[PDB]
Amino acid sequence: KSCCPNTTGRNIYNTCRLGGGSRERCASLSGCKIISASTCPSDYPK
């Protein structure tokens, strides 16, 4: 799932995972926020 203030980041996170890359690897790549239990933080999933 993960949440990102801009699809630009969610893109790397999403594609990253789509390419077999840990959630953290992409997180450090773009800068999205990693949540838990799916539920997203405030409301910045894109």
UniProtKB/Swiss-Prot annotation:
Give the location in the cell. Secreted
Q: Which domain of life is it from?
A: Eukaryota
Q: Which cysteines are joined by disulfide bonds?
A: 3-40, 4-32, 16-26
Q: What does this protein do?
A: Thionins are small plant proteins which are toxic to animal cells. They seem to exert their toxic effect at the level of the cell membrane. Their precise function is not known.
Similarity remark: Belongs to the plant thionin (TC 1.C.44) family.
Instruction: Kindly provide the name given to this protein in its UniProt entry.
Output: Viscotoxin-B
Organism of this sequence: Viscum album
- Tell me the part of the parent protein that is shown: 7 to 52 of 103
